Amino acid sequence: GGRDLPSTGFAWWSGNARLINLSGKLLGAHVAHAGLIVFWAGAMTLFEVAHFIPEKPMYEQGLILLPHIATLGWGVGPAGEVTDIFPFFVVGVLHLISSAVLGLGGIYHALRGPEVLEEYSSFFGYDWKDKNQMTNIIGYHLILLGCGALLLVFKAMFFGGVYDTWAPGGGDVRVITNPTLNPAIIFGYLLKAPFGGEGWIISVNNMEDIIGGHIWIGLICISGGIWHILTKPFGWARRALIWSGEAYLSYSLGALSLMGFIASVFVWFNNTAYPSEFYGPTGMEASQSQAFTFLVRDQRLGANIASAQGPTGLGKYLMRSPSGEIIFGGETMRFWDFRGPWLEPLRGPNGLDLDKLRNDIQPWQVRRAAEYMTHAPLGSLNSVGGVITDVNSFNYVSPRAWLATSHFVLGFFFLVGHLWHAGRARAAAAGFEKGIDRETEPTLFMPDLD
């Protein structure tokens, strides 16, 4: 294929578009880029390990990868205390070396390997219009994805377990012996409203549900992989979809935008797959923690926190949710759907329980609430912690803030890319992506509007 504008029709700034029909070069680009991803995983892990002070919390040190490893149950014990630093190092080293291998392969295919693969092999050669081959590649990758989900399941069940922040006796790494395979729970998660108090799938709150849903995901992905290997797209799919490389790219871009938004919300709200031990409190958690901290302090001072009415007439410390549940008062009324391992022991069937509040509060809960209140996910861009009017002496931005902001931004720009490529794929399939033909300008053959 050509490597300039005259021979390709694409400028340098759209040079990767020149690869659309060079399957070998495209494969090289993909493999090298995968090498970039794995390289970042390894290098960032080693950086985080090197810059890790293991007696300080992870979320106080700007770490986003080490929490992922800790959640999987590696190198941590009860309450998230880092037992062994070596497994983090091993994850990083393995990713770095494998990235070397992937980069070598991507360079080979991009620079010297065969330009196209179709006259080399039918198995690896593909045509974008070859619907059966495209569904074959879908099938292979679906099988792989289901296998990866089952790898998560195997780690949680047979290889030491995963970190369970809801464990009795304290959050700890525990082995999940009874995943919920019950499809009612698993698929009723997908039907929950994406609004406050329901939290469509962000509300999954126990590792049994997570592991069981991953068993279901693995089975679904593998069976769909086989289904796509053994069939071709049906008539309705053929009549509804654009069948081109750019169209498939646009479809994947839409999917990725959806996943990016979901991940940003997930890290912002969920404290089960993102234990606060490693990611710090959620904003909801920190607000509730402040309310709890001052309930505890004022109660020790002698305030009768059940009957103390605030300035507006609502309870200063306790109040009712619009459905009647007893909740913390103040602005944190909006966060009454929050559930956390440190707060549920004080919750009764009706909400917060006066008897537990008056005699069941443990010193570790007070310490945890103070920590979470002071590590609220508020911070400046230059990493000054606290409310924006605070002064420069607290260097902290929550990992939840970093992850949520970054992935909302990436989700948005991938929605933009999906719009761009979907529109372009449609126009190119219909053949007017290069502009209006003067001879057959469609609007010239149309009746005037009025």
Partner 1 sequence: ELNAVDAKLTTDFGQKIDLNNSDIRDFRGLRGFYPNLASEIIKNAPYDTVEEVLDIPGLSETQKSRLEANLGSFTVTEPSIELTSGDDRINPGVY
Partner 2 sequence: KSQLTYDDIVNTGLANVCPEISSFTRGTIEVEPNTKYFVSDFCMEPQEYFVKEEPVNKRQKAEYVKGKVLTRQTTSLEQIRGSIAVGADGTLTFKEKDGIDFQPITVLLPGGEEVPFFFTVKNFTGTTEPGFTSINSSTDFVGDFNVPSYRGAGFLDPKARGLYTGYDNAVALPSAADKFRTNKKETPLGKGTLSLQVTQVDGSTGEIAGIFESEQPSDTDLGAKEPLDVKVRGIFYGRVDTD
Partner 3 sequence: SIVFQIALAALVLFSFVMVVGVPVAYASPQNWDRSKPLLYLGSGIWAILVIVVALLNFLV
Ligand X SMILES: CCCCCCCCCCCCCCCCCC(=O)OC[C@H](CO[C@@H]1O[C@H](CO)[C@H](O)[C@H](O)[C@H]1O)OC(=O)CCCCCCCCCCCCCCCCC
Ligand Y SMILES: CCCCCCCCCCCCCCCCCC(=O)OC[C@H](CO[C@@H]1O[C@H](CO[C@H]2O[C@H](CO)[C@H](O)[C@H](O)[C@H]2O)[C@H](O)[C@H](O)[C@H]1O)OC(=O)CCCCCCCCCCCCCCCCC
At which residue do the structure tokens 């990436």 appear? 410
Nearer to ligand Y, 183 or 196 (CB): 196
Supply the DSSP string of 287-316, one letter for each residue.
HHHHHHHHHHHHHHHT--TTT-B-TTSSBS
Structure tokens at 119: 């006259």
Cα separation, 70 vs 80, in Å, equals: 8
> Among all chains, which residue has been given the structure tokens 């086989």?
226
Q: Where are the beta strands (DSSP E) in 72-224?
A: 162-164, 172-174
Asked if 98 is part of the footprint of ligand X (rule: CB under 6 A), the reply reads yes
Q: Which two tokens stand for residue 45?
A: 């892990």
Alpha-carbon span 286 to 400, nearest angstrom: 12
For partner 2, the closer CB: 298 or 325: 325
Span 124-183, contacts to ligand CLA by CB under 6 A:
124, 138, 142
When the beta carbons of 105 and 148 are compared against partner 3, the nearer one is 105
Residue given tokens 């505890």 in the structure block: 296
Shorter beta-carbon distance to partner 2: residue 193 or 255: 193
Binding at 112: pick from ligand CLA, partner 3, partner 2, none (beta carbon under 5-8 Å per type): partner 3
Choose from partner 3, ligand X, partner 2, none: what does 318 bind? Cβ within 5-8 Å by kind. Answer: partner 2
Smallest distance, ligand X to C-beta of residue 170, A? 17
Nearest distance in Å: CB 103, partner 3: 9
Q: Give the one residue of 54, 78, 233, 386 binding ligand CLA; rule: CB under 6 A.
A: 233
Which residues, listed in sequence order, are joined to residue 319 by a DSSP beta bridge? 327
Which H or E run contains 445?
A: none
Q: Which residues of 36-51 are buried (b: 16+ CB within 10 A; e: fewer)?
A: eebbebbebbbebbee
Write out the residues near partner 2 by the rule CB under 8 A.
197, 304, 306-307, 309-315, 318-326, 347-351, 353-355
CB of 107 to partner 3, least distance (A): 6
Q: Does 36 bind partner 3 (CB under 8 A)?
A: no
Q: Which of 304, 297, 305 lies closest to 328 in space, CA to CA?
A: 305
| 430 Cα distance to chain centroid | 36
> Closest distance between ligand CLA and the C-beta of residue 300, in Å?
47
Residue 108 binds to partner 3 (criterion: CB under 8 A): yes
Contacts of 431 (CB under 8 A, 6+ apart): none
Structure tokens at 339: 């559930």
Q: Which does 269 bind (CB under 5 to 8 A by kind): partner 1, ligand Y, ligand X, none?
A: ligand Y
Q: Which residue has the tokens 């974008």?
A: 128
Q: Smaller CB distance to partner 2: residue 194 or 197?
A: 197
DSSP secondary structure letter of residue 18: G
User: Which one of the spans 7-15, 106-114, 304-312, 374-382 is the region binding partner 3 (CB under 8 A)?
Assistant: 106-114
Edge to edge, the sheet with strand 326-328 lists 318-320, 326-328, 351-352, 347-348
From residue 330, give the alpha-carbon distance in Å to each of 57, 107, 185: 29, 59, 34
94 binds, among partner 1, ligand CLA, ligand X, none (CB under 5 to 8 A by kind): ligand X
Q: Which residues on neighbouring strands pair with residue 164, listed in sequence order? A: 172
Q: Which of residues 252-311 bind partner 1 (CB under 8 A)?
A: 294, 298, 300-305, 307-311
Residue 97 sits in the site that holds partner 3 (CB under 8 A)? yes
Q: Footprint of ligand Y on this chain (CB under 6 A)?
A: 194-200, 202-203, 205, 261-262, 265, 269-272, 284, 337-340, 412, 415
Q: Which residues are annotated as a binding site for [CaMn4O5] cluster?
A: 331, 334
260 makes contact with ligand CLA (CB under 6 A): no
Among 95, 214, 400, 407, binds ligand X (CB under 6 A): 95
Contacts to ligand X by CB under 6 A:
38, 74, 86-87, 90-91, 94-95, 98, 159-160
Chain residues binding partner 1 by CB under 8 A are 294, 298, 300-305, 307-311, 316
